[PDB]
Amino acid sequence: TGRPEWIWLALGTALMGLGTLYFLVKGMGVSDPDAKKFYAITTLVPAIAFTMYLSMLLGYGLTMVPFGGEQNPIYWARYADWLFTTPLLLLNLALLVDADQGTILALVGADGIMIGTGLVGALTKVYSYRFVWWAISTAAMLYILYVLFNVTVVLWSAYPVVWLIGSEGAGIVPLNIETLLFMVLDVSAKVGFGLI
Amino acid sequence: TGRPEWIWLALGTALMGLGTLYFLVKGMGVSDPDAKKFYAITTLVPAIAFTMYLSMLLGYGLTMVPFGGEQNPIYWARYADWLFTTPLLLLNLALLVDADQGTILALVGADGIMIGTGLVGALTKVYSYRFVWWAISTAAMLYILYVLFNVTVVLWSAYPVVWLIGSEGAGIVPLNIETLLFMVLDVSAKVGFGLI
Amino acid sequence: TGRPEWIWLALGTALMGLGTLYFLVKGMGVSDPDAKKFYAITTLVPAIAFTMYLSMLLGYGLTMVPFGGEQNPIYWARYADWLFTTPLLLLNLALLVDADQGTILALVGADGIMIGTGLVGALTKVYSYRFVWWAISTAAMLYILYVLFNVTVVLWSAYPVVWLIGSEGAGIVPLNIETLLFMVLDVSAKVGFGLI
Numbered sequence: 037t038g039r040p041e042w043i044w045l046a047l048g049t050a051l052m053g054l055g056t057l058y059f060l061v062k063g064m065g066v067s068d069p070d071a072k073k074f075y076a077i078t079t080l081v082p083a084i085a086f087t088m089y090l091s092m093l094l095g096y097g098l099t100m101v102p103f104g105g106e107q108n109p110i111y112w113a114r115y116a117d118w119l120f121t122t123p124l125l126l127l128n129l130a131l132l133v134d135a136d137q138g139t140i141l142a143l144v145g146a147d148g149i150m151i152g153t154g155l156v157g158a159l160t161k162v163y164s165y166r167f168v169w170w171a172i173s174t175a176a177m178l179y180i181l182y183v184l185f186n187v188t189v190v191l192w193s194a195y196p197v198v199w200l201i202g203s204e205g206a207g208i209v210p211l212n213i214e215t216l217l218f219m220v221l222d223v224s225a226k227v228g229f230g231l232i
Numbered sequence: 233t234g235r236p237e238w239i240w241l242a243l244g245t246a247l248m249g250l251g252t253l254y255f256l257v258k259g260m261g262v263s264d265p266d267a268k269k270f271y272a273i274t275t276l277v278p279a280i281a282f283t284m285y286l287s288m289l290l291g292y293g294l295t296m297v298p299f300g301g302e303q304n305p306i307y308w309a310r311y312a313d314w315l316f317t318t319p320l321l322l323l324n325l326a327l328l329v330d331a332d333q334g335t336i337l338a339l340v341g342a343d344g345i346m347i348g349t350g351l352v353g354a355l356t357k358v359y360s361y362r363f364v365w366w367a368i369s370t371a372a373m374l375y376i377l378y379v380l381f382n383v384t385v386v387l388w389s390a391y392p393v394v395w396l397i398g399s400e401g402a403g404i405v406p407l408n409i410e411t412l413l414f415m416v417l418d419v420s421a422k423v424g425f426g427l428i
Numbered sequence: 429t430g431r432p433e434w435i436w437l438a439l440g441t442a443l444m445g446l447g448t449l450y451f452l453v454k455g456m457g458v459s460d461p462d463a464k465k466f467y468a469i470t471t472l473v474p475a476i477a478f479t480m481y482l483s484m485l486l487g488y489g490l491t492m493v494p495f496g497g498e499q500n501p502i503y504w505a506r507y508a509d510w511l512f513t514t515p516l517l518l519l520n521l522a523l524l525v526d527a528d529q530g531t532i533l534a535l536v537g538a539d540g541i542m543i544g545t546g547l548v549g550a551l552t553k554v555y556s557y558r559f560v561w562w563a564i565s566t567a568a569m570l571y572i573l574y575v576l577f578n579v580t581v582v583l584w585s586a587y588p589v590v591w592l593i594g595s596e597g598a599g600i601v602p603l604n605i606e607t608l609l610f611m612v613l614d615v616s617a618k619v620g621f622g623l624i
């Protein structure tokens with residue numbers, strides 16, 4: 037079909053489904069309560085991402101916010117997916133370092149302004165302001181990364197970079213490739229980090 | 233007024249209000265903490281449903297997604313209501329069988345993709361895809377019903393059936409009756425199951 | 429710029445940022461888990477409010493729902509902000525009076541219908557119904573204030589008053605001043621109550 041990045045969306049869908057299937061199959065037997073918590077969180081993330089990728093694939097989680105004299109396609113379902121998977125991720129990270137609820141709520145709270153503000157950046161029609169939201173979102177990311185303190189850092193910090201050179205940002209790489217880099221980013225975070 | 237199913241919406245509003253009133257009155261005296269938790273959850277569900285039904289009654293939680301060559305009315309407030317009442321319900325079911333947070337989060341997590349995906353099915357303009365979302369939502373329902381394991385099963389499984397023959401699905405029964413069957417479904421789940 | 433209340437939005441942004449900065453700086457050193465919980469909640473509220481005020485300032489969290497023969501500007505980001513800050517607030521109040529989860533969920537549950545219904549009132553195009561939602565929202569406020577039982581009462585009860593004489597309600601004071609009174613209201617609740 038006519039949308040260059042459909043194949044990256046299609047690859048994304050496939051890899052998220054499969055990994056869900058995989059963590060689902062792998063969850064059985066888990067009776068240890070704690071272990072069940074880890075498993076449920078690890079299974080749910082790609083599940084969610086699977087439905088989000090399918091919606092973008094299907095062209096539903098996509099919309100054309102105008103800016104820079106341009107009518108631009110924006111996959112708002114990306115943010116929809118990060119809104120729910122990133123705090124769960126942190127839930128997992130919180131069990132590792134065994135973080136208090138105090139730490140947890142600020143971590144999860146900083147996380148929501150993060151994706152909430154990038155989605156606002158995503159959807160603003162006044163190009164100049166997009167980066168203000170981008171910087172406020174990036175500033176919340178560093179809070180999280182900072183309380184969270186080696187691969188989450190590099191993995192999470194790459195989203196703001198691809199956004200910035202992305203076609204939602206400076207516009208340095210076409211959408212077809214920005215989509216590509218997010219997919220690779222989402223699969224490693226949703227599936228590999230869960231595998232790892 | 234001109235919308236055939238307004239009376240089913242009106243009946244729905246009335247029954248949700250009344251039952252709220254009822255569980256509200258019945259909650260007083262509850263000092264036992266656990267009991268308070270059961271009461272709060274049972275009171276809140278119809279409360280929410282009361283406001284959702286009123287909005288659809290008032291014609292506000294309604295919208296006309298086009299598909300099948302048709303401009304179709306879709307009560308998106310139904311999903312808005314299920315998004316919040318169904319996990320609370322499960323909260324209650326979780327206390328019965330005393331389910332771990334592990335079990336609880338997957339149960340509540342499976343539940344959100346469930347209504348999230350049906351709402352997407354609800355709102356897609358490409359008729360063919362509606363059922364793909366319908367099946368992904370139904371597949372999450374069975375996870376829940378399956379971890380949840382005799383009346384929740386029959387009650388919950390009826391939503392996907394009415395959706396399917398519903399005017400949001402195959403279109404086998406007109407909207408005026410699909411609304412009817414959901415109301416009967418929602419009241420028994422929101423009020424009777426709470427009573428029961 | 430051309431929107432009379434921009435300065436109240438600008439003042440609002442500034443005061444929310446500063447107080448965030450302030451509670452952020454003040455949070456450091458906190459190792460006591462409980463104390464961390466109080467600090468995280470107190471820091472997060474103005475953070476959120478800071479981004480909401482900026483969006484309204486930037487004219488993004490604003491929209492023009494028509495009613496009374498009029499095309500009216502409605503700052504939906506106000507509700508977006510209350511949706512998340514008010515339950516956190518109550519989280520704090522819950523720690524003071526040390527409220528059970530039972531009490532907590534009804535408190536937080538009543539709170540969501542509250543802002544959810546006012547936003548519906550905010551957005552209905554049939555002027556008459558706006559107040560029905562207003563009264564249902566106000567009725568949920570009194571539940572909260574009532575379980576919550578001296579300044580939260582007066583502070584929280586003022587939102588429904590300014591709404592009512594506000595330009596989203598009876599229209600007794602122009603928007604430029606309704607915005608003013610909410611800002612003063614939000615800063616004292618978001619920052620002063622946190623300071624206090």
Ligand SMILES: CC(C)CCCCCCCCCCCC[C@@H](C)CCCCCCCC(C)C
Binds near residue numbers: 054058223224227231
């Ligand atoms: C991995 C095992 C043991 C079970 C199978 C899991 C099911 C899903 C298969 C896809 C998993 C993803 C690979 C993990 C690592 C990442 C960095 C993700 C890279 C994604 C891009 C695809 C490139 C192809 C691959 C060699 C995986």
Ligand SMILES: CC(C)CCCCCCCCCCCC[C@@H](C)CCCCCCCC(C)C
Binds near residue numbers: 420423427
């Ligand atoms: C029931 C008691 C003890 C208190 C009163 C509760 C307040 C609400 C009244 C409505 C309650 C609903 C009935 C419970 C059972 C269900 C299967 C729901 C069926 C709904 C349809 C209406 C048909 C009429 C009735 C005979 C209730």
Ligand SMILES: CC(C)CCCCCCCCCCCC[C@@H](C)CCCCCCCC(C)C
Binds near residue numbers: 443446447450615623
């Ligand atoms: C207050 C201390 C110790 C630290 C500084 C906090 C950072 C933010 C500064 C603004 C704080 C707000 C004042 C608290 C009280 C309120 C009732 C809010 C009133 C808001 C309106 C502005 C009027 C100016 C002021 C005198 C604050």
Ligand SMILES: *C\C=C(C)/C=C/C=C(C)/C=C/C1=C(C)CCCC1(C)C
Binds near residue numbers: 122151153174196
């Ligand atoms: C899917 C799994 C993870 C960990 C996804 C993480 C996403 C982010 C950290 C995205 C961050 C953004 C920032 C910091 C700034 C621009 C907007 C984004 C939401 C892309």
Ligand SMILES: *C\C=C(C)/C=C/C=C(C)/C=C/C1=C(C)CCCC1(C)C
Binds near residue numbers: 321347350388389
């Ligand atoms: C209101 C109380 C309950 C238990 C409501 C339950 C609703 C569902 C189980 C709805 C399920 C759907 C599915 C499985 C598929 C189509 C979309 C629906 C959301 C209608």
Ligand SMILES: *C\C=C(C)/C=C/C=C(C)/C=C/C1=C(C)CCCC1(C)C
Binds near residue numbers: 513547584587
């Ligand atoms: C920002 C901090 C707090 C405590 C904000 C509180 C807001 C309210 C209590 C708002 C209440 C409303 C009601 C009761 C009726 C009309 C709609 C409103 C949401 C404005």
